[model samples]
Target: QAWWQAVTRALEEFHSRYPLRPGLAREELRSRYFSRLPARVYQALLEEWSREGRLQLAANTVALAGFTPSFSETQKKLLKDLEDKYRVSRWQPPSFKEVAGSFNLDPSELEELLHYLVREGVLVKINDEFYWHRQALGEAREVIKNLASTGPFGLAEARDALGSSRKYVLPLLEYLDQVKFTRRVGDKRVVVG
Candidate 1:
């Protein structure tokens, strides 16, 4: 009974904010319902609602049910094509402008699609010039995770393991640090839990 009201407010708030995008940070939603009930109750509600398909839940966010960003048929085709480019490129993907030039897509259109993919967790933005496929990024994380168990590893070690260069490795390490997947201790990185 009480739970439904909170769900309504949260969903309504998210709908009003980004009516078509899939999610809001889970912590943001949790805080919105903070004053309504115990934390345990909120957790239970999220679990129940997600299981019932009233919402979509991910590691750090929750989203409205059945929500997908709007795209024209042409745009959808472009998305599929662009994703394939990233997929095949794997460890070293093209720069944003590179892909745009190759596909002859307008900068605005490409930027919007890339931003959506980043938000949806299909792409990881390493910098303005690079976005890695999330699949490859996940694989890189696993490599680092395995290495971390031995001892803190430095940039050279990561570059060697990834078979990538400093250009990619440096930014990748910094992004990992920013995300708290690894912490920068002097010159090396130690994996975060």
Candidate 2:
């Protein structure tokens, strides 16, 4: 009923379950506890709590600062295993779906740790489903020097060289263009230098 009470409840509910994760979607937080509360109370209290630094309001989520979730031992092992998977899969990085399926955790549980990897640059997102190591700019150049020597090539050919699908190859090619390792010439990609 009270503003502080609402805010406190939100914080407690969020932290109580996912000790290592911060933030909840606004919709979930709202519908669960404040659904019956009028918009004025919701909006005003949101502003008050947001401004007071008790909660933060992002576009579609609310979070408390310093609420980074910790992991269980299994989760830690999962994290390391995923990291190792990523390192070797740089050429054929697995889809997030595949990773999710392999993990026993829920989305909320898996995402934060995976996202932490992204933020740390331990994981790189190439295509939508691809996340793995990124070769250095120089390394990319050297690889291209060998592959593109035969002239312009299509996605299939590139992937054949990269030893992966278009999923990883496409993004690697795009990054090739980004760093000027290769240039897009119509439907084919050619070495730039």
Candidate 3:
């Protein structure tokens, strides 16, 4: 069978065994995975997940499995640094080159690895940039711990703290907003959940 036909057949069979939610129309699935991989690959992966019981047909299937990715030491350290810096204050998103420089890795290699992490959802791509997944509660916990050592912070405070110009800072903040991680209250921000 052709790739698309095979994927469609796989998804249909998978969904028959593990029906999707009534509310989960095609668009939801597309948004969740299309940007990360080809539609055929995404469909195949879902089928694989279903056959493995990583997903179920029941209504409660949403709770069946969680996604996680193993990270290299460098990637883990980078995420740790971002969490630490942002816990005390809002943070500007670092450029790939900046992060590469910190780890003394070649910029191109770092960029490739960064893209891979984004595709795997270990890191979330936001407005063409990226951040560690907040669902990784350990990462959030580390940030909160750092926040305790510092104090409450606003966006302006975060910008100043990072010593990055607002040009870079504003887009990062906007992306955070898009992801529902934080909200603007007056001139400051409060973490979501």
Candidate 4:
């Protein structure tokens, strides 16, 4: 109980100290504040905090509730422009390298910016080569739904239904499989649920 309160106070202090960066790398919190505590104990506290709505845990960081990754005005502008481009292209959206090259953006910075878009649910990263706008993919789902009306189909049907090519459709289908939106039956796919 004492350590629980100590963790709470520490989180409050850390957030207060860095208003712009309320999320702390999980490892930092573990090492800098609670190194003496067993990792399992610290993790249990984190899980408890999350369930209590006191904090948020992501893949590599933890933040006080209501915290989100902050972006600057310029970065926001760039994301807006990029989103428009992806929206226009729809399923044929540009690859990661293509966008980076076209915008002459720093690859490292672009990675984080695109990652933010993914986190915000504005984009779905089907693979390293592509990030489909959520709306675009939503429409694709509709197409798949319609395709299912005719029964289970092969990749060509999916490609023709989507009005795209194997280059893009194949990966999207695989992603759909990965997400359990569809299941492979023999050489075709059947929509699952």
Candidate 5:
């Protein structure tokens, strides 16, 4: 009886706050029921509700059950086309704003799709505004390896070697540093295995 009330109360609070698509963060939902009961019970309720098709979950966010995406055939083609365009950008992809604009997609849709593509290894995120196709990442790694082979290199040298401006080169090199392919010295950088 007490447990039933908890579920009922949870539904009421949830429906009020999340009346539309893209409902709420997972943490927000869990926090509401978290303190009231032990973790597993309401966790079961949430999972059961989702499994029964009362909710939609993606990217650690939840939405109303009705919020499924239904892209047209033309939209599918557009997604494929966008993938190709991103692929060609190689290591230095375009700004996300420009990329999102070119796709004729809303930022929500673009991020949703990008989440899947990135999961499937179809794309890779470098920094805030740049992405690469997985194959392009390999090529970019080869370029970095070639630079690192000759020992430590400076920012300007990387910019010149890659034929890019400071704007793109800095982030690109930093990305290599993050992935452990390169390590930074006082001012220059060296390659790693």
Candidate 6:
């Protein structure tokens, strides 16, 4: 089976054994599965997902699927703290250290999870930082569709409206240029052949 599939299956078994609870512990879940696999392999899987965003999705999916799963008390508390701290902002991408600290995980493992998110296109890196692309893309499509329905927008204006930083905005604009979606005239972006 694929690595992700294996991970998903393991998590499913874990939920089955432990059942759902209001407050779960990470160490408890870890202890339950640790004996099932070699220490090194287990550590690698944890480190990889913690570094990447897949683990977050996995956890979210599991929670939404009606299983609370488990986390150490400290881990659970830290997550609550992070959520409270960052939830107010419209855009707050947590850094490797922040996520690690929140989950009481190693920094290196958190970095690995971040990288994995980028590789999977669940997040997109722009200007050396990452944003949630799946969410962004859906928003972008809505904006573009709205504009196209009324009339074409100037290139710069369209990019600005998308709210993406220059690095990400430029590549997409360039692609549109290649596809004849827009044309440039003396530094001005205009919709044309």
Output the worst ten-in-a-row residue range by lDDT, candidate 1.
19-28
Best by TM-score: 1
Give per-residue CA lDDT, model 1, range 60-126, as digits (tens).
5677777665678887888778778887887788989899999898999899888767776778898
What TM-score fits each model?
A: 0.77, 0.52, 0.36, 0.66, 0.60, 0.36
Worst 10 residues of 6 by lDDT: 56-65
Off by over 4 Å in 2: 1-71, 135-141, 178-181, 191-193
Residue 62 error, candidate 5, Å: 25
Q: Clash pairs of candidate 4?
A: none
Query: Model 4 shows how many backbone clashes?
Result: 0
How does residue 84 of candidate 3 score in lDDT? 48
Per-residue lDDT over 103-172 for candidate 5, one digit per residue giving the tens place of the 0 to 100 score: 7778887786676556445677778787777787777667777877887889998877777788877887
lDDT for each candidate structure:
0.81, 0.69, 0.50, 0.83, 0.69, 0.50
lDDT of 4 by residue, 56-98 (tens): 7765567778755456887778888988999999999999999
Per-residue lDDT of candidate 6, residues 1-193 (tens digit): 3656655676666556754332223344356555676657765665567666455333212211344435566655654454444333213345445556766778664454444344434454432333434455445546655655565566566666776565455655564466566565665555552
Q: Over the stretch 1-193, how does candidate 3's per-residue lDDT look in tens digits?
A: 2543443554554445543221133334556446566668766655666687754322112213332224567666765564443333334445555556766777666666665444433454455543434343234434533542465556566556546566655765676667676667777766666
List candidate 6 stretches off by more than 4 Å.
1-66, 78-106, 111-128, 133-138, 150-155, 167-193
Error of 5 at 133 (Å): 1.8
Cα error, candidate 5, residue 18 (Å)? 22
Cα lDDT of model 2 by residue, 1-193, tens digit: 4746766677778777856543566667678777897767777777877787777665445667556457778877887898887776667666788878877667666677777566445565655666755453235456667777877788888767656676667787886687676799889888874
Off by over 4 Å in 5: 1-72
- The clash count of every prediction, one per candidate, is 0, 5, 1, 0, 0, 12
